[PDB]
Design a protein around this ligand. Structure first.
Ligand code: MYA
Ligand code: MYA
Ligand code: MYA
Ligand code: MG
Ligand code: MG
Ligand code: MG
Ligand code: MG
Ligand code: MG
Ligand code: MG
Ligand code: MG
Lengths: 152, 135, 152, 142, 141, 152
């Protein structure tokens, strides 16, 4: 079913440091998506290199990896219809300069190197990142009491 | 006069069920529109089983270009296209459960108001901030 | 059953005029109570003298009635366990001067003659106010999707 | 130092189900406490509390387990939750704002420092407790 | 008239630094009080309090304000919560936002006479703005 | 460095009268911009004529000046990367009819003559307006504790 699509959302160290964890989680809860998994950790450099491997030939990659390791992140899996694309809409443009008011980035940050949050860009990237950051024992299954009111 | 335009806004059963009535009314109040009428009822059958499935909040709101601006504030009818910052953009996912309905035109609005409300349920009063919302 | 207890809540003309209808309804929704009935009207002075009949000899009664007729009110019936007592706690003390931060009155008003809201003071008074303001066909029955998570 | 005290906070399945995870975390963040650990798991209140009364808990469901740090965070956390029985909780507290019945009181917090250390030992591995410094620490503490 | 009482409220550097100016102002506005004056300046808490142990803040930004309304001195104090955040209730500014008395983010006058003294000391008379709120008749009888 | 750009934001008399000062300041604070200057005043007509001199001969110029003088305003200077353009995005379109939900004007007002807020349209206008409304002693300097999490 399309309603079982999952995406990986990570609140970056600046999101934690500036006290935005609750605000972000609230936006996803109130949209109607279901929290599947969540943990709080300092990701190692090797872990972050595997996560950002597609960008290793980019000039900012050394900085990116350093900053993603400079504090703890909140790693999460969320489930719902088109949650990948829709979550990307909710985050706003990757460059906060282009993000619109009402989006997470549009409301809460300024510079691309401090854009507080990451979300999977595709279903395939989503499954790879979910597998990288979480094990199957860490995924929680339940039915939201409001399911029949969110979905037809 | 253009400032006395009215629109019909109905919160559907999924909006009542998920606890969104207060937020919706708040967005309309803080925009500067005036509540003209409101009632809470079960939608009788005159799809359409689904709107009887629960209660609806029927409302009439007044203000300049309130029909179109209301539609903007609701967001696109299909939540998949709704922008963050709109009611549907913030709170729902699927068109069959898009929690709210607003009139699409002035004539539609006056038809819906006649159909859902009696004329005496439409309350006339002046907002104490009217001179600060309108010139 | 104790969970089917109902109370009458009325947002007074100053609550409407100062744009607090949404905030108040939101507080009752998020507490877990079920909206049973709601309408918007300018109550007649006759109606208001019947509502406040117990205070007809008080010095402020004529002014109270006039002010309650000077604008529209939002009349509501809400349902839940100990909703009369608990709704009164949520409103704050009837005299805003003694209302606490976190309550409706404590957060939003100042003077007893402009205390923006009324709630039934007892189950008795609640049922007579419900009968005065609403017809039984105007009372809406449905089950909340979150009922099993609000009540054991 | 007293600023290094910790408490255990668990959002129960009714809190997850009614969409309150963000609100709760936000109240703790804005108070000034530091999130030390957090994970999402399935756990039953029934089985955790089955060895109890000696002579009506929620079944297995999703819970958010957390460890929070700060001065007097155990007691102040309990104040922020409000009374365990929502009927006695004051508006402005988590339970005062969001729930009605004690069997569905959406959240749990440790009632004493040693209880808190025990619960943290029970729920978390030592390596899940993350050490970092809040950028606002010097503005929360003198 | 008692409805013209005034109080002095100062947001301290920890309140500015933690991004709380808007929330605090919003609580006073929504309560129904009228903003009379406001300015943003650099001030040292030490030099001000040692001008007439908990370690006070050095020179930093403060938002100084004057608010008007019935019983605003006392009610303002209630809305701030107890001076020691350890005793502040949820729903108050200090109950919601801070932990330690030396970083209690805000100050309010403790009495009408204190309020008038501090208003004179921090503000010029022409900085006190007189206007009528459009909702005044719905806040006061 | 580009992160020190400053813009002039003014909350107009209708913004004060409808109780929006806190909401607006909150949106700027939570975005990551730094408050540099702020005061509360009734601007004189001649001050307002200087401020809007570029519009000195339009049909509405006389009305504008008289309304901007009809109540107090909150004048402010805010600092950050691209604060001029980004602040204009946050305000929404000058005409509320075109402002989008999530913007200040989109969320809070309706008509161009009552658009509750003003922001500098360019850096040059920003430097001119900041000098007109504030003297250098009124500009307050400090480093945000979160600077290193807002800027790379
Ligand atoms: C077609 C495109 C590629 C535009 C699709 O849109 P796309 O999303 O591919 O645009 P992107 O390739 O720029 O972004 C990819 C990633 O690279 C991150 N990143 C980008 N630029 C910088 C930078 N200067 N410093 C530090 N990090 C930077 C950026 O946040 C994003 O990571 P994350 O936020 O998703 O984790
Ligand atoms: C305590 O119980 P007790 O029976 O001793 O008196 P009460 O404090 O319950 O007030 C009962 C009602 O009277 C209203 N009212 C009271 N005083 C004034 C006043 N000076 N001016 C105008 N209205 C006033 C008051 O709001 C409340 O109505 P509501 O808030 O429920 O609509
Ligand atoms: C870009 C097109 O170029 P354009 O020439 O449209 O520039 P502008 O749209 O930015 O506005 C410049 C200023 O003009 C003000 N104003 C404009 N129209 C009216 C009006 N009917 N009645 C009263 N005031 C009006 C308007 O608020 C704005 O000032 P502020 O909002 O920044 O304070
Ligand atoms: Mg990045
Ligand atoms: Mg849209
Ligand atoms: Mg529709
Ligand atoms: Mg009495
Ligand atoms: Mg039903
Ligand atoms: Mg418990
Ligand atoms: Mg003090």
């Amino acid at each position: 079913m399309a309603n079982l699509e999952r995406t990986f959302i990570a609140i970056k160290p600046d999101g934690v440091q500036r006290g935005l964890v609750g605000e972000i989680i609230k936006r996803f809860e109130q949209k109607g998506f279901r929290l599947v998994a969540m943990k709080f950790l300092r990701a190692s450099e090797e872990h972050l290199k595997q996560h950002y491997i597609d960008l290793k030939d980019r000039p900012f990659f050394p900085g990116l990896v350093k900053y993603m390791n400079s504090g703890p992140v909140v790693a999460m899996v969320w489930e719902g219809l088109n949650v990948v694309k829709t979550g990307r809409v909710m985050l706003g443009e990757t460059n906060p300069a282009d993000s619109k008011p009402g989006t997470i980035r549009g409301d809460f940050c300024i510079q691309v190197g401090r854009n507080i949050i990451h979300g999977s860009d595709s279903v395939k990237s989503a499954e790879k990142e979910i597998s990288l950051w979480f094990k199957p024992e860490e995924l929680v299954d339940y039915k939201s009491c409001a399911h029949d009111w969110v979905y037809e």
